């Protein structure tokens, strides 16, 4: 891993709320380790009035599924583009649904509650089993 790096005060404020800062590359190993969790991409950008969203409702989501212990990560602004591409969310703000150490999908659309429950539940209906392929190294050379 790295040494942890707060890019700016605008960034570090998210770390004050919590969550792990991940990259498009190192998110792979992160997922396999945590098993169950959600990655927050670069969500809502600035507008003009305070009609923004900001990740505050993701907490109640997490606590609504207390069956698993979810780890939440943040994909910065840059990593979100590569990560979004990889998980086929195109390039739009969405939460990545990871359970069982495997990808369930993304949450693009469905913003208010009620519908979110059934929509997400439809995807996380039944638990599964992961392929289990964790190649970790100490020092092969670097």
Tab-separated table of C-alpha atoms in Angstrom, residues 3-104:
chain	number	residue	atom	x	y	z
A	3	UNK	CA	1.536	6.168	2.819
A	4	UNK	CA	-1.958	7.698	2.576
A	5	UNK	CA	-2.089	11.080	0.875
A	6	UNK	CA	-4.660	13.865	1.389
A	7	UNK	CA	-4.508	15.743	-1.919
A	8	UNK	CA	-6.073	18.864	-0.416
A	9	UNK	CA	-8.174	20.244	2.433
A	10	UNK	CA	-11.138	19.858	0.089
A	11	UNK	CA	-10.239	16.186	-0.165
A	12	UNK	CA	-9.204	15.445	3.422
A	13	UNK	CA	-12.626	16.595	4.681
A	14	UNK	CA	-14.004	13.347	3.224
A	15	UNK	CA	-11.398	11.399	5.191
A	16	UNK	CA	-12.678	13.186	8.282
A	17	UNK	CA	-15.997	11.481	7.542
A	18	UNK	CA	-14.087	8.281	6.907
A	19	UNK	CA	-13.769	5.772	4.071
A	20	UNK	CA	-10.680	4.507	2.267
A	21	UNK	CA	-9.012	6.442	-0.595
A	22	UNK	CA	-8.457	4.027	-3.489
A	23	UNK	CA	-7.054	4.054	-7.016
A	24	UNK	CA	-8.238	2.343	-10.192
A	25	UNK	CA	-5.415	-0.171	-9.838
A	26	UNK	CA	-5.204	-0.817	-6.090
A	27	UNK	CA	-9.007	-1.020	-5.769
A	28	UNK	CA	-8.734	-4.590	-7.094
A	29	UNK	CA	-6.726	-5.841	-4.102
A	30	UNK	CA	-8.857	-3.711	-1.794
A	31	UNK	CA	-12.075	-5.404	-2.928
A	32	UNK	CA	-10.673	-8.928	-2.604
A	33	UNK	CA	-9.616	-8.140	0.965
A	34	UNK	CA	-12.804	-6.451	2.162
A	35	UNK	CA	-15.233	-8.745	0.359
A	36	UNK	CA	-18.256	-6.627	1.134
A	37	UNK	CA	-18.365	-2.910	0.523
A	38	UNK	CA	-19.213	0.006	-1.725
A	39	UNK	CA	-17.055	2.375	-3.744
A	40	UNK	CA	-18.222	5.966	-4.068
A	41	UNK	CA	-17.232	7.580	-7.346
A	42	UNK	CA	-17.073	11.308	-8.020
A	43	UNK	CA	-20.773	11.921	-7.443
A	44	UNK	CA	-22.461	15.314	-7.621
A	45	UNK	CA	-20.557	18.274	-9.084
A	46	UNK	CA	-21.135	21.933	-8.262
A	47	UNK	CA	-24.090	23.759	-9.783
A	48	UNK	CA	-25.153	27.257	-8.778
A	49	UNK	CA	-27.632	26.914	-5.863
A	50	UNK	CA	-27.200	24.369	-3.066
A	51	UNK	CA	-29.221	21.764	-4.955
A	52	UNK	CA	-26.244	19.425	-4.588
A	53	UNK	CA	-26.329	16.021	-2.916
A	54	UNK	CA	-23.021	15.062	-1.262
A	55	UNK	CA	-22.520	11.560	0.226
A	56	UNK	CA	-24.537	11.659	3.456
A	57	UNK	CA	-27.344	9.186	2.735
A	58	UNK	CA	-24.925	6.343	2.031
A	59	UNK	CA	-24.601	5.860	5.799
A	60	UNK	CA	-28.247	4.855	6.272
A	61	UNK	CA	-27.932	2.566	3.248
A	62	UNK	CA	-25.010	0.784	4.889
A	63	UNK	CA	-26.926	0.361	8.156
A	64	UNK	CA	-30.001	-0.917	6.313
A	65	UNK	CA	-28.045	-4.033	5.375
A	66	UNK	CA	-26.450	-5.004	8.732
A	67	UNK	CA	-25.927	-8.572	7.555
A	68	UNK	CA	-22.525	-7.645	6.158
A	69	UNK	CA	-19.780	-5.355	7.413
A	70	UNK	CA	-19.330	-3.002	4.483
A	71	UNK	CA	-16.195	-1.009	3.817
A	72	UNK	CA	-16.725	2.196	1.868
A	73	UNK	CA	-14.068	3.652	-0.400
A	74	UNK	CA	-13.673	6.864	-2.380
A	75	UNK	CA	-12.373	6.860	-5.946
A	76	UNK	CA	-11.247	10.515	-6.056
A	77	UNK	CA	-12.127	12.494	-9.199
A	78	UNK	CA	-9.590	10.912	-11.543
A	79	UNK	CA	-9.798	7.270	-10.456
A	80	UNK	CA	-13.588	7.439	-10.795
A	81	UNK	CA	-13.202	7.704	-14.575
A	82	UNK	CA	-11.025	4.604	-14.902
A	83	UNK	CA	-12.934	2.676	-12.233
A	84	UNK	CA	-16.259	3.649	-13.769
A	85	UNK	CA	-15.021	2.458	-17.143
A	86	UNK	CA	-13.885	-0.877	-15.700
A	87	UNK	CA	-17.169	-1.641	-13.928
A	88	UNK	CA	-19.136	-0.437	-16.950
A	89	UNK	CA	-20.915	2.453	-15.249
A	90	UNK	CA	-19.700	4.450	-18.246
A	91	UNK	CA	-18.707	7.704	-16.517
A	92	UNK	CA	-21.655	8.641	-14.326
A	93	UNK	CA	-21.956	8.963	-10.518
A	94	UNK	CA	-22.897	5.653	-8.920
A	95	UNK	CA	-22.139	3.406	-6.003
A	96	UNK	CA	-20.400	0.117	-6.744
A	97	UNK	CA	-22.098	-2.830	-5.110
A	98	UNK	CA	-19.551	-5.324	-3.856
A	99	UNK	CA	-20.495	-8.363	-1.832
A	100	UNK	CA	-19.080	-11.863	-1.397
A	101	UNK	CA	-15.853	-10.470	-2.806
A	102	UNK	CA	-17.582	-10.206	-6.176
A	103	UNK	CA	-19.168	-7.422	-8.243
A	104	UNK	CA	-22.946	-7.238	-8.100
